[PDB]
Structure formats: structure tokens, C-alpha cells
Amino acid sequence: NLKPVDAMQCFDCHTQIEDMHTVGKHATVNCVHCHDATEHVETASSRRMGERPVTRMDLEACATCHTAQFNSFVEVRHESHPRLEKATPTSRSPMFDKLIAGHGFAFEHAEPRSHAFMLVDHFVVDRAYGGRFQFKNWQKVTDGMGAVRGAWTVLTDADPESSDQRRFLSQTATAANPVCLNCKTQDHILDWAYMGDEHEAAKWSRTSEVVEFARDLNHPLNCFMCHDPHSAGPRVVRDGLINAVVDRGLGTYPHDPVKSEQQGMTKVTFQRGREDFRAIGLLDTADSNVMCAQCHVEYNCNPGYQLSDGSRVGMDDRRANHFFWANVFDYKEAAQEIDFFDFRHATTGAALPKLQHPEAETFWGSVHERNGVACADCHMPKVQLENGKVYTSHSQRTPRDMMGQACLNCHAEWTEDQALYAIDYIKNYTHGKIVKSEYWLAKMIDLFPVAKRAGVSEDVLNQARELHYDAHLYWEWWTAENSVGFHNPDQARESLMTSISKSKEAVSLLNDAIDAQVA
Amino acid sequence: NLKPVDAMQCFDCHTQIEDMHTVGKHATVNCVHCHDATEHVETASSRRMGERPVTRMDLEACATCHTAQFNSFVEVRHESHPRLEKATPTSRSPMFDKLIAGHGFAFEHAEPRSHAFMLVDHFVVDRAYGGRFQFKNWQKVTDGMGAVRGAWTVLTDADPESSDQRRFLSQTATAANPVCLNCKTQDHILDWAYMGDEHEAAKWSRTSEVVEFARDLNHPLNCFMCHDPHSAGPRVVRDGLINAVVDRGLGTYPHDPVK
Amino acid sequence: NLKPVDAMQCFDCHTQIEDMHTVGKHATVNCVHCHDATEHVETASSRRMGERPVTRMDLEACATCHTAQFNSFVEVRHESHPRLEKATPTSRSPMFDKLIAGHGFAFEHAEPRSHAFMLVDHFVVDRAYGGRFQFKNWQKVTDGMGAVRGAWTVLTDADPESSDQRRFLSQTATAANPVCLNCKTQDHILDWAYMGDEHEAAKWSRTSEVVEFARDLNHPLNCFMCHDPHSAGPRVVRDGLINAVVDRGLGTYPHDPVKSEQQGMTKVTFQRGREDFRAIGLLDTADSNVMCAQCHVEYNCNPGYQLSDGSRVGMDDRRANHFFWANVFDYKEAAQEIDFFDFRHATTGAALPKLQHPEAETFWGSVHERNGVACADCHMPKVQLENGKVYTSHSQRTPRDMMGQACLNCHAEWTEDQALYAIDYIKNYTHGKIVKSEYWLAKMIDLFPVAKRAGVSEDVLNQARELHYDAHLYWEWWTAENSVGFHNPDQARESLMTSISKSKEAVSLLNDAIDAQVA
Numbered sequence A, C: 001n002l003k004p005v006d007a008m009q010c011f012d013c014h015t016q017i018e019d020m021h022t023v024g025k026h027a028t029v030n031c032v033h034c035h036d037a038t039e040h041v042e043t044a045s046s047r048r049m050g051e052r053p054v055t056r057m058d059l060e061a062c063a064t065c066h067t068a069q070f071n072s073f074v075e076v077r078h079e080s081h082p083r084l085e086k087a088t089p090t091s092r093s094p095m096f097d098k099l100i101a102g103h104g105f106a107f108e109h110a111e112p113r114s115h116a117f118m119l120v121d122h123f124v125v126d127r128a129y130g131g132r133f134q135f136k137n138w139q140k141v142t143d144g145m146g147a148v149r150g151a152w153t154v155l156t157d158a159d160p161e162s163s164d165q166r167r168f169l170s171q172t173a174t175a176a177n178p179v180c181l182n183c184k185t186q187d188h189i190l191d192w193a194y195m196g197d198e199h200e201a202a203k204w205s206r207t208s209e210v211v212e213f214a215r216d217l218n219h220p221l222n223c224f225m226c227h228d229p230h231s232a233g234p235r236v237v238r239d240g241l242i243n244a245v246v247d248r249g250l251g252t253y254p255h256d257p258v259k260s261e262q263q264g265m266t267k268v269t270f271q272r273g274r275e276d277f278r279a280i281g282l283l284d285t286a287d288s289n290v291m292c293a294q295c296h297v298e299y300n301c302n303p304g305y306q307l308s309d310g311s312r313v314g315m316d317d318r319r320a321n322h323f324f325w326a327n328v329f330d331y332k333e334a335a336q337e338i339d340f341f342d343f344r345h346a347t348t349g350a351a352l353p354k355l356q357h358p359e360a361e362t363f364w365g366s367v368h369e370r371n372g373v374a375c376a377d378c379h380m381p382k383v384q385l386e387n388g389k390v391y392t393s394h395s396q397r398t399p400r401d402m403m404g405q406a407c408l409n410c411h412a413e414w415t416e417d418q419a420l421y422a423i424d425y426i427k428n429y430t431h432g433k434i435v436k437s438e439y440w441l442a443k444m445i446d447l448f449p450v451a452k453r454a455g456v457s458e459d460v461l462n463q464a465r466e467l468h469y470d471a472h473l474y475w476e477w478w479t480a481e482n483s484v485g486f487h488n489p490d491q492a493r494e495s496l497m498t499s500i501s502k503s504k505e506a507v508s509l510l511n512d513a514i515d516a517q518v519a
Numbered sequence B: 001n002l003k004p005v006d007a008m009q010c011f012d013c014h015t016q017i018e019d020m021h022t023v024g025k026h027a028t029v030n031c032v033h034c035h036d037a038t039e040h041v042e043t044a045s046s047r048r049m050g051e052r053p054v055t056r057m058d059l060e061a062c063a064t065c066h067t068a069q070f071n072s073f074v075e076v077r078h079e080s081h082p083r084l085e086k087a088t089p090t091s092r093s094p095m096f097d098k099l100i101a102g103h104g105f106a107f108e109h110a111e112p113r114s115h116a117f118m119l120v121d122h123f124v125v126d127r128a129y130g131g132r133f134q135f136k137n138w139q140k141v142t143d144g145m146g147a148v149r150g151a152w153t154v155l156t157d158a159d160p161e162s163s164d165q166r167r168f169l170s171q172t173a174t175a176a177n178p179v180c181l182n183c184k185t186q187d188h189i190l191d192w193a194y195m196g197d198e199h200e201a202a203k204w205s206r207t208s209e210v211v212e213f214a215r216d217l218n219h220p221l222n223c224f225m226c227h228d229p230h231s232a233g234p235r236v237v238r239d240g241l242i243n244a245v246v247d248r249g250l251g252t253y254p255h256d257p258v259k
């Protein structure tokens, strides 16, 4: 059984923790629930750690007193189809392979599934580690609780004796790097300096061997990613988000200074050897928009190239860990600002961006966001009980599974079927425009080889490449973004029409140039 | 927000609690979750209580860290038909009135329903308090969470100015007495001497005015009836059961000495 | 009412039947249930048949005493969508037309449906008989019992006065030949010599007019295909299977000699005029793996061409009735061994194989097969009754319809939804790789015309054609195979990655050669 330690001993050296812990809703929660610090207390000085205390980062450290939230979190939504490739006619991006040719996502890009699996899915996807990591057997794919207990309880490593990224299966890639892990786990929260910069006190950084780092990580979406363990107050821990909101002064709601001030973030820094080491962002309110924006954003978490001169931008560069914190119509400016692109298209030769799940930046400015609605209202609603203590569901999933608690709790004028119908109207319309956008992108792409064989000039091809950047951006945002337009229907529509317009312009340019060579 | 107290100071006087608390699965649970002892600590000696500390007996004291058990407990099983008289042809004892004639159960004896309602149901049944206590309105019969929060949040007393047992409705009885309450609540666990014997330190006993006692009681089936709050270990608190098992030497399984 | 005949009279001449019948579980079943032999007994000699006895091959001959098995067999699974073309974006092979161009399956290839319909579906499919045979009207498509009673009770023939294969509808083919029928019916079991070789006593053979043969056939999947009618013991009757297992000595489990010996096959031959005529394969155990492998295998049942010199291989050749009895990674060797390919691709000119439903050869080596699981455990499970005599369900269908009897009977650790989720993980992953494999095959195929117009050398085109064979094989196995990887997930994955690798190699080769002509 646990035996409490004297927190006053700790508070002598840990004044920020004292301030947070004594004032918040965990003032009665003893340190032993999460730290084994006996040898540390015997050996530390005011400025030197001595022996490192052991800190629990498993989610069961919180389940101890918060079983309802834990159990809701670890539920597996079996209706969220697993390992479902997006580059298929029945999924989100039927022409993805042609359009993304040159990028690692061509090797595999599945739809998301339940949060329990985030770390294991990151480890096993064909694009990440060359097939090095696999489930121990095909039964383990169902085991959400097991994945939560730890990735290495359900996975195997093809070669524990080597730590290099390489291909073990032929049609895999090795895109994973240390920055990725920040959106899969925070088991490394005490071992990673802010932004992944090099730091004497950091075991891991942007430039680490990712296979070695992987082996040290266990748990998905730790509870403390949104809740400070010392104050129990709302927070974020993700460096890239704090960097956008606070360091760059963009605010929590970059389009609304008033809401940014009311629902702000305060950066708190922790030191090692009296040098800044790590940071968190305490929130003014329990604002799920900002909590979920730790991960559900467009980002760089990867090497790339400069738009200006094509030079390589490696993991050592700060730009390899970057939150753009820009809506679709501000993204090109944001990427030009940091002088960055992701890949060159394998057929067209265009420098292109790679977009990922920009839910937060899409939600901005929507009617829902402007009315003060937040992600949790639809995806983590309060549970309605005839008799009981209310709590917040932590099963982050589609509102279709809890329409009474989600949509219908605000939209009294609708039946469930009516609300579903409104969702589907938007998704169906948006998906139609995604498909048309892909049709036109593909038409343009297929003209590049014809133009090259016809002897069309490099000047014309470069004009078309510039159009490809925009055609790509204004399409891929929406295959990347998970709501199929629901989060911001008007923006999806305007963007996708812009994509089609750009592709059409490029098609006309290339066809005319080919015709003139003939011729 | 709760602020923890120095448990080690309490332990300088409370040695049994120290032994229980420090060894069990509540060793990290601070006393402030259940006791407001500020004035007590300022005034007590090992031999004199001084100011009485306030002890929480509401089930929400435990729901704080054990929501799953609390929420399962307070669920109302709507299929457990409520206020269903047993002395009817379609229930358990069709000829009960003839057979029980002379006993107060002839006035009303319903089937049991969900535990959330035990104390309110005891208070309002026609055989118990002469009809003195009633739900505030007929809607409140559904409110299990409300009953758990406290009986007096959902009930009324026909005459707060008197404390005698009497009939307010013609076909009622006044069978309730203080002993009954021991199977409805343990809100009185610090105010009732073992067995309900007279005791200088007991506010309530077998001979108390049951209407006055009733008014001091709120919560059904307190969580600590089965779980010691200090050790978190399994227990009973009911005097009559301890008396049978231990005092009278009958054992927990009278027909199996080994068990 | 039936009147029994004196079996001892028959046993005087039929000593193999005596031996089988007197010892097995049909020792009390009189010959009159299946044979009208009165005139035969009056006219036969020890070595000459005399008048031919009439043998019942309708399934109702067995339903008489085995109603439960009959009724389960004839059930129509309405959820098995009928006449559903595979070459569509929502089915198994979205790019099948491009990839299979040159082959008769381009005319129509639907998903399988319930067994009751196998013979009628063979007769009416657009690729088989030029549209000659059709349902009497569109209502008859529902009539499983009717199809079982006989094909010609529910079908019409456009021209009873001619027996040639020809097109009656414009977009049909005439691919059917006598070998096909062996996997649709065994009504011809006494009229077809082993392998379909020419034989004095055979009415039908590989070289027969298929339209004439068709008209003589009635019943699907006769009960006696798996159960000897004389001993009631387990067997196979399909010549090609016996040829692989016994004649070629490959065994019932070619990858496991021990299991092959324990679960073997004994070839029993019947003569006409004291010349070998037909054969059956008695099984040591009631092994559904081998029973179902009568049909759910990759085979030749068709003319083709030699790999060595391109010469025609006609129906007269033994190779026109052949079970390869090889896994996907052994198939190229098996086809080279018999010097055979199916068609030349209409665009690339590559000699290609045509694969069909290799379920048996895929299942080998899977975790399930290695643990002693067999087809019936998932597709013909025992029926669970609260009170009753257990029998084996003969409704061969997806285990999704009987998860308690199938998966969950072995996998106690799972709920139904969890087991379904495990299936879907595999199928979704496998289907994604099928789609990607098709993407790369199509990319390669489309380069052939460009390369030809560019003047790329025949040597380079032939190199690419050799790659096409492999790219094709390692893809088409999995669109042909019905489990979408579930039967052997690891093999599907390795094969499909090999397909993509081969196509990519060919794309690079062709693009480089085109570029060099330009450059």
C-alpha cells in the first residue's frame, strides 16, 4: 500500500510546485501517487537533482481516483474502422497516390481510430519505421486497454540489436522522427527540452535516433496533457502550441484578440541547472479548443526544403517542430514566412506543402466557434444521468454516438435524424468538391509528362508548378482535415473552389503550350 | 479548495486511527476530506474533546475519488415497481391482511425498491410516522439522487412544531422507533451508543423521540457502512450484527465453524 | 412408395461397392434410394453393363434422411449481394478492366453468392456462353430451391436448335468449356472420365461441345461431392485435386508431410470394360480443407499458351484441367513447370497468368491452418442448441452470420464486436494494398503506349513485360482470393508489397527509356 511522503520537504526546493499544489484542487493529493523520490530527497541539493526521482506517467496513476474519466477514455469505438487506407475509392482521397506522389504518406495513410491506439498506430504504420515495429500478433489490434498499459506490451521490434531507421518490409518508409512523438505521448515530458532543442539535461531531442526514443515510450495521450497534475487546472504541454500562442504572441484565438485575452495561456517554465528546460501553458479556462489543438493542427514535424533555394531543412532546425497556427487562406503566407516546403511532386516537380489534420485552424471563425462552442461540446460532452454525479465523457469520438448529449443538447428544434441530415448535407457537398478538386489536380498532373515530351519550356512548367502549390494546398487541407467540411462549411467550399480554379488555370496553360509545340 | 491538515498531530491523540489509517489503502487520504477539525485541534487534549470536529457523512465525500461506485449505487431501477403493496392478489402475500391482523404491517407493506430511497421510504410509509412525513410532491418519488443528497431535500413534515408520534392520516400507524433507523442510515454513527443503550455521550438511543431523531438524519446506506473510512478495509457497523456474531459468540457462519 | 432391391444381387458384380457399403454408415441404406437398376440387373454381365441403371444425383435423394443438412445448404443468404461486378470502385478490384484487358473476365466478373446458385450463375454470366442462357424472367434470380431442383427449371436457352458457342448479346464472351462444370456440379460423375480425357465410355470430355454438355446438367454442389454415397465417409471427387494430391504425390498439405500422412487421401478407381475410367479420393478424416479445395483453388480450366514459344494449348491438352496446388510464391514456378500462361495483356503485350479464388493455397501456413483449424470451423460450424441433436450447418457463408458458433467458440477473450474488428483490420489493410497495387500496375500499363510511340526498344518493352507478369501475379492473387487477406494476412502483405515493387521497377525502366528517346 502507498505511504505518503512529507510534501513540505519537497516544497523547500520546489517552490513553483508548492505554489501550484497548495492552491489547486490536488492540494490533498500526496506526491507518492506519482513520484518515488526517496533516494532523490537523500541526495538532492537546492540546485542539483542528485538521484533522479521516478515519475509515473501511466494513465492508471489518475484512474486511481478518476475511474469514470479513465474508463471513458480507454473505450474502443469499434465502429471507427481500423487500418482503413484513405487512398481508396471508398475513403477520403480516392486520387491521393497520384496527388501525393513524392511524399512518404504514399506508403500508407489510414483514417484515425480511437485515441487508445495513437502510439501503437504511430509505431506500426507502414510510413513510419520501415516496418520495424508490428503488433505481436493480429489479435492485438483490438487491445485498447493493452496499448494504454504500454505500447511494448502489444508490439514487437524486428531487430532489438540495431537502432537505425531502415526498411524491414519493401513498401515502407522511415518518416518517423522524434518530433512526431509529441503528439502521441508525453511520457518524455521530463526528458525533452522545449521545442526539442539540444540541451544538456535532455535525453531526447529533435536530432535523436527515433528508434531509440521509441523504445523509451509507452502510453498514449497522457491525462496530464490537458490537466496539470499539481494544480489539477487546465493546461497544455505541447511545445509547438505554446510557441505559437505565447512566444510568437499570436494568441489562443488569433482572429479574436478579445477572446484570446479572456481565454488565454500563461507560459510556465521549469529549469535544469538554472537554465530554462521545459514549459507548460496554463489556461485561463478549461478550453478544449486549445487543449485539442496540441495535436489536431497543421504542423511541421519533419525535415523539408526551403522555398527560396531548395536547400535542405533538417531536424536540427527549429522549423522541423513548428505549428503554423494559420487558417487555410493564411497558410501559404505562413510557409513562405519560414521559407519552407515539404516535398517535390514526383511527376510535376512542384515544391508542395504537406497538410495534416488542421481541425483547430479550420474551426476558427465558424458559426459554432463564434458562438463559443468548443471541441468538447461535440466530442467530449457531459454525461446525462437520471440519477448520478455528472462527469465529462472522455471518449473522444463522433457526436453521432451521443446526439442527445452533443447536438440535440443545443438544437432543441431538431430530432436526431434531422441533425444527422444536416451533418450529411455538409459532408456530402464537401466530399463532392474534394473529389472534383482531385479530378482537376490529376488532369493537370497528367499533362506534365506530355508537356515535357512536347518540349514545353521550363518557364511554362514553372508557372504551372506555382499553380500546383495553390491547387494542392486548397485541396489537401480538406482531405487532411477530419470533419469533411463540417467544422467550417463555408471555408471548405471557398477553398475547394479555389483549388479547382487553380488546377483549371494550369490545365489551360499546359494544354495551350503543348498545342503550340504541336502547331 | 480543500487544504490538508497535519494528520500526524491528530495521531498524537488518535492512536487507533493512526494504526488503521497508516497501514491501509487510505494512508494517503487526508482527514480534511471528511473532518473539519480546526477548532477541535485548537481545544482538545488527549483526555478532553474540546470543540467537536464536524464529520461528513454524505456519500459524496467518497464520490470525490470513487465516482463509478457512487454512480452505480445511486441508479434507480425503474423496473423495481414502487409503492407496490404486498397484500394484494398480484403480489407476494395475497392473504396478508387476514394473516397479519393485529400487526402494524397491515397499514402498509410495499415491496422493496432501489437503495437510494431507503430512508425516505421508511419516513413516508403509512405504517411508520402516522403520515407525518410525505414527499414534497408526487414528482419527487422519482428522485433517487435527491434522496441520496438528503431526505429533507425531498420530504415535508406535517407539523414541525411537535415531536410526538401521532396519526395525521386516518389509516396510518406510528411503528417507527429509533432502532429502525440503523438499517436506513448511519448518519448517527457518532451519536448513538452501541445497541442504542443509554449513554452520557449519546444524543440518541432506543428511547429517543423518533420524530426528533428522524429530523437529524439525511443519507441512505452510507458508503462507510461496509468500508472503514480510515483503513478502506471491509467492515460492518451495525450494532445488532456485531452483537450476534461476536458478543454472543455465534460467528459469521453459525452453521460452519471453519468458515 | 420405394421398394427395396436385393443388394446381394448387385454385390455379385460390384465388389468395391460391397466392400464400401457393407462396412460404412450406409450399410442399411438400400440401393433403390439412388438407383433404378431393374433392367440393368436383367441385362448386365460380369464385365458388360447391359442396360444402364438410372442414378439419381439430385440433392433431394439425400434430403430424404438428412433434411437438416439439406435445408441449411439450400438457404439463400440475401445479404450476399447478387450479380455484383467486381470491376467497380465500390467492389474488390476498382481497376480490374485496365489490368485484365485481353481476358474474358473483362466481360463480367461478379462476387460469389450462395452455393445454390453456382450452376445457374455459371450458365448465365456474360463471360460464359455468349448470353445464350438466361433466367426465365428476372424474378427467378431469387429462387435458390428452384436452382437446386435443376438449372433448367429456372433458365432458358436462346436457341435450342444449335449447339455452338456464339454471342447472342454483343458484350459477352464464350469462355465456358467442359472443365468448368466440374466445379459447378457432379451430375456428370458417371459420364466423364478422369481428367476429362477421351474415353470410349465417356459421354463428355474436355473436347465436348460445352453447350450440349450444359443441357445435360442440373444440380449444384451435389451432396456426394464430399460424402461417399456408399460408405457415407468423407471424400473428394474432383479429378484435378486427386491428380495434385495423389498422382503428383504432393499430398493434402504440401508444406507439411506429417499432416499430409495423418490427413491423407486414397485414390479409388472404377473401370469400364476393365479400363480405368473414373476415380474418387477417400479422406482419412472429414477434412473440410481438402473437401473445399475441390473448387476453392487456383486452376487451369481453359485453353492458353506456352510461355516458351507462345503456341496454343487447347482443351485437348491435359494442362487445360490442372490444379497448380501452389501458394502465391510457388505459382510462377508451377506455371513455368507446365509451360503455360493464360492471356496476353491487350495493352502491354505481356504474357500473363489468370488467377482464380486460391483460398485453399492461401490458407496453408496461416496461424489458423497451423493450429489445425479448417474451413468448416468458420464457414460450416456445428449448430449450438439449448436442447437438440447437434448437426453441422451446411450454409457455407461468412462467419459474421454465426459468430458464436464460429470465431467466439474458440476466442473466448473477445466479444463479437472485437472479433469483427480484428477481421476488418486485416481486410481494410489488405484492400488498401490491393488498391495501391492496382494504382502502380495501371501507371505501368499506361506507359506502354507512350513508350511504343516514343520508339522505346523491344528489348526494354520485353524487360517490362517480364516485370508485368510478376506485378500481375502478386496483385491478382488477392482480388481473386475471397477473404481480402483474412485467410493469410502476412502472405497477402508480402505479396502485395512485391507487386508494388515490381510495378515501380517497370515504371522507372519505362520512364527512363521514354526520357532517353526524348533526350
Ligand code: HEC
Pocket (backbone or CB within 6 Å): A005, A006, A007, A009, A010, A011, A012, A013, A014, A031, A035, A037, A038, A040, A041, A044, A045, A046, A047, A048, A049, A052, A053, A055, A190, A271, A272, A273, A274
Ligand atoms: C532540494 C534539496 C530538493 C528536495 C528537498 C526535493 N527536490 Fe526534487 N529536485 C531538486 C532539484 C534541484 C531538481 C532538478 C530541477 C530543478 O528544479 O533544479 C529536482 C527535480 C525533481 C523532479 C524532476 C525529475 C526529472 O526527471 O526531471 C521531480 C519529479 C522532483 N524533483 C520531485 C521531488 C519530490 C516529490 C520531492 C519531495 C519528496 C522532492 N523533489 C524534493 C531538488 C529537490
Ligand code: HEC
Pocket (backbone or CB within 6 Å): A025, A026, A029, A030, A033, A061, A062, A063, A064, A065, A066, A223, A224, A227, A228, A229, A231, A232, A233, A234, B064, B065
Ligand atoms: C486521488 C488520490 C487523486 C489522484 C491520484 C488524482 N486526482 Fe485528480 N482530483 C482528486 C480530487 C480529490 C479532486 C477534487 C475534486 C473536486 O471537484 O473538488 C481532483 C480534481 C481533479 C480535476 C478537476 C480540476 C478542476 O480544477 O476542476 C482534474 C482535471 C483532475 N483531478 C485530474 C487528475 C489527473 C490528470 C490525475 C493523474 C495525473 C489525477 N487527477 C489524479 C483526486 C485525485
Ligand code: HEC
Pocket (backbone or CB within 6 Å): A108, A109, A110, A111, A112, A113, A121, A122, A123, A125, A127, A128, A175, A176, A177, A179, A180, A181, A182, A183, A294, A295, A296, A297, A298, A299, A300, A301, A302, A356, A357, A480, A482
Ligand atoms: C501533432 C501536431 C502531430 C504530429 C507532430 C504527428 N501527428 Fe500523427 N496524428 C495526429 C493527429 C491529430 C492524428 C489523428 C487525425 C488524423 O488525421 O489522422 C494523427 C494520426 C496519425 C496516424 C494514424 C492515421 C494514419 O495516418 O495512418 C499515424 C500512423 C500517425 N499520425 C503517424 C505520425 C508520424 C509518423 C508522425 C511524424 C512524421 C506524426 N504522426 C506526427 C497528430 C500529429
Ligand code: HEC
Pocket (backbone or CB within 6 Å): A059, A062, A063, A066, A069, A070, A071, A073, A221, A222, A223, A224, A225, A226, A227, A286, A287, A288, A291, A292, A376, A380, A390, A391, A392, A393, A394
Ligand atoms: C485533453 C485532450 C484532455 C485529456 C488528455 C484528459 N482530459 Fe480530462 N477533461 C478534459 C476536458 C475538456 C474536461 C471538461 C472541462 C470542463 O470544465 O468542461 C475534462 C474534465 C476532467 C475532470 C473533471 C471532472 C469532469 O468534468 O469529468 C477530470 C477529473 C478529468 N478530466 C480527468 C481526466 C483523466 C483521469 C484523464 C486521463 C484518463 C483525462 N482527464 C484526460 C480534457 C482532457
Ligand code: HEC
Pocket (backbone or CB within 6 Å): B005, B006, B007, B009, B010, B011, B012, B013, B014, B031, B035, B037, B040, B041, B044, B045, B046, B047, B048, B049, B052, B053, B055, B190
Ligand atoms: C489530542 C490533543 C487530540 C488531537 C490532536 C486530535 N483529537 Fe480528535 N479527539 C480527541 C479526543 C479526546 C476526542 C474525544 C473522543 C475520545 O477518543 O476520547 C476526539 C474526538 C474526535 C472525533 C470524534 C468526534 C465525535 O463526533 O464524536 C473526531 C472525528 C476527531 N477527534 C478527529 C480528529 C482530527 C481529524 C484530528 C487532527 C486534525 C484530531 N481529532 C486531533 C483528541 C484529539
Ligand code: HEC
Pocket (backbone or CB within 6 Å): A064, A065, B025, B026, B029, B030, B033, B061, B062, B063, B064, B065, B066, B223, B224, B227, B228, B229, B231, B232, B233, B234
Ligand atoms: C480520494 C482523496 C479518496 C477519498 C475521498 C476516498 N477514497 Fe477510497 N480510496 C482512495 C485511494 C487512492 C484508494 C486505493 C486504490 C487502490 O486500489 O490502491 C482507495 C481505496 C478504497 C477502497 C478499496 C480498499 C481495499 O481494497 O482495501 C475502498 C473500499 C474505498 N476506497 C472506499 C472509500 C470510501 C467508502 C470513501 C468515503 C468514506 C472513500 N473511499 C473516500 C481514494 C479515496
Ligand code: HEC
Pocket (backbone or CB within 6 Å): B108, B109, B110, B111, B112, B113, B121, B122, B123, B125, B127, B128, B175, B176, B177, B179, B180, B181, B182, B183
Ligand atoms: C435492519 C435489520 C432493518 C430494520 C431495523 C428495519 N428495516 Fe425496514 N427494511 C430492511 C430491509 C433489508 C428492507 C428491504 C427488504 C424488504 O423486505 O422490504 C426494508 C424495507 C423497508 C421498507 C420498504 C418496504 C415496505 O415494507 O414498505 C420500509 C417502509 C421499512 N423498511 C420501514 C421500516 C420501519 C418502520 C422499521 C422500524 C419499525 C424498519 N423498517 C426497520 C431492514 C430493516
Ligand code: HEC
Pocket (backbone or CB within 6 Å): B136, B137, B138, B139
Ligand atoms: C402540461 C399540459 C402537463 C402535462 C401534459 C402533464 N403535466 Fe404533470 N404537471 C404539470 C404541472 C404544471 C404540474 C405542477 C408543477 C409544479 O411543481 O407546480 C404537474 C405536476 C405533476 C405531478 C405532481 C402532482 C402532485 O404533486 O399532486 C406529477 C406526478 C405529474 N405532473 C406527472 C405527470 C405525468 C406522469 C404526466 C403524463 C401522464 C403529466 N404529468 C402530464 C403539467 C403537465
Ligand code: HEC
Pocket (backbone or CB within 6 Å): C005, C006, C007, C009, C010, C011, C012, C013, C014, C031, C035, C037, C038, C040, C041, C044, C045, C046, C047, C048, C049, C052, C053, C055, C190, C271, C272, C273, C274
Ligand atoms: C453383373 C451381372 C452385375 C449385376 C448383378 C449388377 N451390375 Fe451394375 N454394372 C455391371 C457392370 C459390368 C457395370 C459397368 C462398370 C463395371 O463395373 O464394369 C455396371 C455399372 C453399374 C453402375 C454405373 C452406371 C453408369 O451410369 O456408369 C451402377 C450405378 C450400377 N451398376 C448399379 C447396380 C445395382 C444397383 C445393382 C443391383 C440392383 C447392380 N448394378 C447389379 C454389372 C452388374
Ligand code: HEC
Pocket (backbone or CB within 6 Å): C025, C026, C029, C030, C033, C061, C062, C063, C064, C065, C066, C223, C224, C227, C228, C229, C231, C232, C233, C234
Ligand atoms: C435414409 C434411407 C438415408 C439416405 C437416403 C441417405 N442417408 Fe446418409 N445416413 C443415413 C443413416 C441411417 C446414417 C447413420 C447415422 C449415424 O450417425 O450413425 C447416415 C450417415 C450419413 C453421414 C455421416 C457419415 C459418417 O461417417 O459419420 C453422411 C455424411 C451421410 N449420411 C450423407 C448422405 C448423403 C450425401 C446422402 C445422399 C447421397 C445420404 N446420406 C443419403 C441414412 C440415409
Ligand code: HEC
Pocket (backbone or CB within 6 Å): C108, C109, C110, C111, C112, C113, C121, C122, C123, C125, C127, C128, C175, C176, C177, C179, C180, C181, C182, C183, C294, C295, C296, C297, C298, C299, C300, C301, C302, C356, C357, C480, C482
Ligand atoms: C473449380 C476449380 C472451378 C472451376 C474449374 C471454375 N470455377 Fe467458377 N467458381 C469457382 C469458385 C470456388 C467460385 C466462387 C468464388 C469466386 O471467387 O467467385 C466460382 C465462381 C464463379 C462464378 C460466379 C462469380 C463470377 O465470377 O461472376 C461464375 C459465373 C463462374 N465461376 C464461372 C466459371 C466459368 C465460366 C468457368 C470455366 C471457364 C469456371 N467458373 C470454372 C470454382 C471454379
Ligand code: HEC
Pocket (backbone or CB within 6 Å): C136, C137, C138, C139
Ligand atoms: C402490382 C401492381 C405490382 C407491383 C406493385 C410490383 N409488381 Fe413486379 N410484377 C408484377 C406483374 C404482374 C409481373 C409479371 C408477372 C408474370 O410472371 O407475368 C411482375 C414482374 C416482376 C419482375 C420480373 C420482371 C421481368 O422479368 O422483366 C420483377 C423482378 C418484379 N416484378 C419485382 C417487383 C418489385 C421488386 C416490386 C417492388 C419494387 C414489384 N415487382 C412491384 C406486378 C407488380
Ligand code: HEC
Pocket (backbone or CB within 6 Å): C059, C062, C063, C066, C069, C070, C071, C073, C221, C222, C223, C224, C225, C226, C227, C286, C287, C288, C291, C292, C376, C380, C390, C391, C392, C393, C394
Ligand atoms: C463438402 C463441400 C460438403 C458437401 C457438398 C456436403 N457436406 Fe455434409 N458435411 C461436410 C462437412 C465438413 C461435415 C462435418 C464433418 C465433421 O465431422 O466435422 C459434414 C457433415 C455431414 C453429415 C454428418 C452429420 C452432421 O455433422 O451434420 C451429414 C449427414 C451430411 N454432412 C450430409 C450432407 C448433405 C445431405 C449434403 C447435401 C445437402 C451434404 N452433406 C453436402 C461437408 C460437405
Ligand code: HEC
Pocket (backbone or CB within 6 Å): A136, A137, A138, A139, C367, C368, C371, C373, C374, C377, C378, C399, C406, C407, C408, C409, C410, C411, C419, C420, C422, C423, C489
Ligand atoms: C478454433 C477452431 C478457431 C476458430 C473457429 C477461430 N480461431 Fe482465430 N485463432 C485460433 C487459434 C488457435 C489461434 C492462435 C492463438 C495463439 O495465440 O496461438 C488463432 C489466431 C487468430 C488470430 C491471429 C492470427 C495471426 O496473428 O496471424 C486472429 C486475428 C484470429 N484468430 C481471429 C479469428 C476470427 C476473427 C475468427 C472467426 C472469423 C477466428 N479467429 C476463428 C483458433 C480459432
Ligand SMILES: O=S([O-])[O-]
Pocket (backbone or CB within 6 Å): A013, A014, A015, A016, A017, A018, A270, A271
Ligand atoms: O517548483 S519547480 O520549479 O521545481
Ligand SMILES: O=S([O-])[O-]
Pocket (backbone or CB within 6 Å): A356, A357
Ligand atoms: O501524421 S500525423 O500528423 O497525422
